[PDB]
Amino acid sequence: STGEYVVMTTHFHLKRKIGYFVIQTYLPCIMTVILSQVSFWLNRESVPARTVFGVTTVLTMTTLSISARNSLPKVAYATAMDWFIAVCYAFVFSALIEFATVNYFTKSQPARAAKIDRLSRIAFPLLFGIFNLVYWATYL
Amino acid sequence: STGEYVVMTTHFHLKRKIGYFVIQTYLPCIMTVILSQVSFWLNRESVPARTVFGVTTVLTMTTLSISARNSLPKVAYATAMDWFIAVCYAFVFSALIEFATV
Amino acid sequence: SILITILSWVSFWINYDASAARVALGITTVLTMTTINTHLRETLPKIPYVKAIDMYLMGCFVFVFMALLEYALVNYIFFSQPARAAAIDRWSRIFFPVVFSFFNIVYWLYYV
Amino acid sequence: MIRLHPDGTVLYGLRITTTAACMMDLRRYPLDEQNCTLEIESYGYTTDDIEFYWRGDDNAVTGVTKIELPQFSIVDYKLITKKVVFSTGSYPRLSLSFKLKRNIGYFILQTYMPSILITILSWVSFWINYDASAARVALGITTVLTMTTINTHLRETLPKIPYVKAIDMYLMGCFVFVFMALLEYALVNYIFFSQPARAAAIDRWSRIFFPVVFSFFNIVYWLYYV
Amino acid sequence: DAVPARTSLGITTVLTMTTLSTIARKSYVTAMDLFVSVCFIFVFSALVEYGTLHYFVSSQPARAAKMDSYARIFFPTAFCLFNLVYWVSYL
Numbered sequence: 001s002t003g004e005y006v007v008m009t010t011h012f013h014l015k016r017k018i019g020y021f022v023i024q025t026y027l028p029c030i031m032t033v034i035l036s037q038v039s040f041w042l043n044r045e046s047v048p049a050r051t052v053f054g055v056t057t058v059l060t061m062t063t064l065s066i067s068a069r070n071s072l073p074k075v076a077y078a079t080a081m082d083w084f085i086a087v088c089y090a091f092v093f094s095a096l097i098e099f100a101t102v103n104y105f106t107k108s109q110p111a112r113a114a115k116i117d118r119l120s121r122i123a124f125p126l127l128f129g130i131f132n133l134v135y136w137a138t139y140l
Numbered sequence: 141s142t143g144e145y146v147v148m149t150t151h152f153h154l155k156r157k158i159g160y161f162v163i164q165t166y167l168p169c170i171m172t173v174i175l176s177q178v179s180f181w182l183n184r185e186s187v188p189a190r191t192v193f194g195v196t197t198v199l200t201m202t203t204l205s206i207s208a209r210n211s212l213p214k215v216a217y218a219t220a221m222d223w224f225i226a227v228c229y230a231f232v233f234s235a236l237i238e239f240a241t242v
Numbered sequence: 243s244i245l246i247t248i249l250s251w252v253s254f255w256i257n258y259d260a261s262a263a264r265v266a267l268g269i270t271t272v273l274t275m276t277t278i279n280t281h282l283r284e285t286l287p288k289i290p291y292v293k294a295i296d297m298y299l300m301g302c303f304v305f306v307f308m309a310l311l312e313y314a315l316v317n318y319i320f321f322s323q324p325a326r327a328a329a330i331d332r333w334s335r336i337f338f339p340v341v342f343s344f345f346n347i348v349y350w351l352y353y354v
Numbered sequence: 355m356i357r358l359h360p361d362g363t364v365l366y367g368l369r370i371t372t373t374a375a376c377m378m379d380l381r382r383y384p385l386d387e388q389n390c391t392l393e394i395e396s397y398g399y400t401t402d403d404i405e406f407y408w409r410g411d412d413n414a415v416t417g418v419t420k421i422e423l424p425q426f427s428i429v430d431y432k433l434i435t436k437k438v439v440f441s442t443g444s445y446p447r448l449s450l451s452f453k454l455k456r457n458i459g460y461f462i463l464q465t466y467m468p469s470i471l472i473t474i475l476s477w478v479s480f481w482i483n484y485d486a487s488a489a490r491v492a493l494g495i496t497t498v499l500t501m502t503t504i505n506t507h508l509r510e511t512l513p514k515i516p517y518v519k520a521i522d523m524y525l526m527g528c529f530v531f532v533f534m535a536l537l538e539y540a541l542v543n544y545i546f547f548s549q550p551a552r553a554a555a556i557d558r559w560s561r562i563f564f565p566v567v568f569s570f571f572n573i574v575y576w577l578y579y580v
Numbered sequence: 581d582a583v584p585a586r587t588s589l590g591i592t593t594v595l596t597m598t599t600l601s602t603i604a605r606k607s608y609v610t611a612m613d614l615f616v617s618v619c620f621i622f623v624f625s626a627l628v629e630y631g632t633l634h635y636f637v638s639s640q641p642a643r644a645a646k647m648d649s650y651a652r653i654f655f656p657t658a659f660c661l662f663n664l665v666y667w668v669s670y671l
């Protein structure tokens with residue numbers, strides 16, 4: 001408003017170290033998603049065991065997400081970690097919905113539940129691996 | 141000790157609003173007690189159902205009391221909400237022991 | 243909360259023969275809703291006067307409580323007359339979602 | 355205070371509260387030794403102008419013994435005298451540095467022994483007869499999930515340090531032990547359906563391996579840090 | 581034989597422990613923060629044990645009865661033992 005001033009500018013460059021956030025949140029979420037596979041390989045009759053398993057996975061995912069998004073500020077857009085957390089989340093709840101619908105379909109015909117498991121056991125891990133392939137390649 | 145000093149005084153009056161605490165703690169208590177009194181209309185043969193029904197009311201009471209008593213500031217004596225929470229918390233034990241003796 | 247209300251609705255389709263399952267569901271929904279409310283009342287900014295989200299959560303709590311009382315009534319009155327309960331099930335299955343959607347429409351028309 | 359003297363020896367005293375900053379290396383947490391310091395120097399006068407020197411080197415700093423921190427303990431303090439060069443000149447400097455050491459006994463019981471007890475508990479699985487599958491599957495699942503929960507909450511309770519520590523190494527080691535025991539039984543289950551000789555073989559082999567391996571790991575761990 | 585009741589009770593107790601934790605952490609590792617997690621460990625291990633019971637119920641019918649016979653008398657022993665280990669260190 002007053003007049004033409006003179007400005008000296010200095011830029012301090014910075015880069016964030018990644019050695020911590022790998023073994024802190026990404027590697028535990030990958031390990032929990034991979035662990036959630038055991039529910040499929042169990043017997044199709046055991047409801048309580050696999051419900052315990054799913055509750056364990058859900059509670060761990062939620063308690064992880066809380067602190068993960070707490071460590072980072074609250075911005076409008078979604079960070080490049082929200083997508084990874086949301087993919088963990090979508091896979092674990094897809095496995096939960098799969099279990100829920102198998103618990104209903106196994107009564108009428110066992111072949112249906114057998115085929116559902118035979119498909120999911122190969123469908124889910126391959127998709128999670130392909131997603132890691134797509135994710136980690138771009139940012140580096 | 142020095143002498144007699146003149147001292148003006150002003151009192152501002154205040155009255156706490158209860159509308160928040162009505163939908164915060166009291167109404168969940170009343171709902172939980174009414175729910176715990178539902179067990180009597182269940183069938184006496186379905187034992188595990190009534191047992192779970194009675195236990196979960198106590199669980200709800202514990203959660204609600206812990207959530208409510210946190211905001212209370214620290215005092216030596218017992219506040220007036222503590223008596224209501226204690227009675228609301230004892231009626232569910234009464235109903236549970238009643239089911240037990242039945 | 244919407245998910246908990248829908249899950250409380252899920253219990254109606256179940257046959258009245260396996261009563262213990264629907265009892266367990268109607269109890270678990272109530273306590274899960276209470277825990278969700280208590281956990282949500284922390285991360286939100288602590289302001290000691292009434293909000294809209296609190297009224298919404300209390301509304302959902304009232305819904306699930308009414309559903310559980312309804313099932314208690316059905317379980318008590320069935321042994322005397324089966325047609326009463328066989329009607330009430332099919333009427334409630336269609337009356338709960340209607341009232342719920344009407345309440346939500348009023349809410350989101352008035353607070354948006 | 356200001357204190358003059360007959361020969362002109364002025365004496366100037368203050369009473370200061372400094373919130374100084376020292377760098378702390380936590381790679382060895384919580385079994386670490388900290389070197390926090392306090393550096394003093396002149397500002398407007400070069401070394402051709404003013405000279406600093408501790409008066410009574412033995413008694414330069416007093417009252418250190420009575421210091422008692424709630425968590426640390428003052429091991430030893432040393433005194434230094436230097437001449438530092440900046441772009442404008444050579445300025446004098448004095449330094450005060452004293453080591454800090456943690457009280458490990460306050461952390462042992464509160465952190466380490468839960469994982470140790472869980473790891474030892476995972477061993478009892480081998481003593482049960484291999485015919486009873488549930489008694490061992492339950493122990494495996496319970497121990498793995500318990501290690502998971504203890505690791506998560508112990509990591510959350512410790513203060514916020516954005517780089518790697520040593521307690522994380524030990525927790526990872528114990529988790530690997532229990533997880534490999536679980537996979538050991540998971541493989542014994544598969545090979546037992548094929549033949550019982552190999553199953554009982556590997557069972558007793560792991561029985562005679564694991565305690566020695568665990569003791570060796572603990573000895574290697576504790577000799578290097580302490 | 582009551583399938584839904586035991587699972588519902590387990591899930592409910594786990595959620596109650598979750599709420600109690602998330603309340604207690606807000607109000608090094610303090611002595612109070614250790615005791616609250618072992619509650620969770622026990623009340624979760626019990627549900628895991630019942631999951632194992634329902635899974636291995638078919639192969640060995642007499643085992644489940646023996647499993648309850650062990651647990652009923654071992655959980656109180658373990659809890660009193662933990663209380664002994666904890667409060668003696670406090671004084």
Ligand SMILES: *[C@@H]1O[C@H](CO)[C@@H](O[C@@H]2O[C@H](CO)[C@@H](O[C@@H]3O[C@H](CO)[C@@H](O)[C@H](O)[C@@H]3O)[C@H](O)[C@H]2NC(C)=O)[C@H](O)[C@H]1NC(C)=O
Nearest residue numbers: 388389390391430431432433434435436449451452453454
């Ligand atoms: C904390 O770290 C500082 C930084 O190294 C330590 O200061 C160092 O102390 C040693 C001896 O106490 C100094 O060695 C001296 O070197 C001169 C060089 O001529 C020599 O004449 C002396 O006889 C002695 O060998 C060293 O220079 C000094 N480092 C710096 C940068 O000043 C300090 O000792 C550490 N804290 C503790 C409690 O040891």
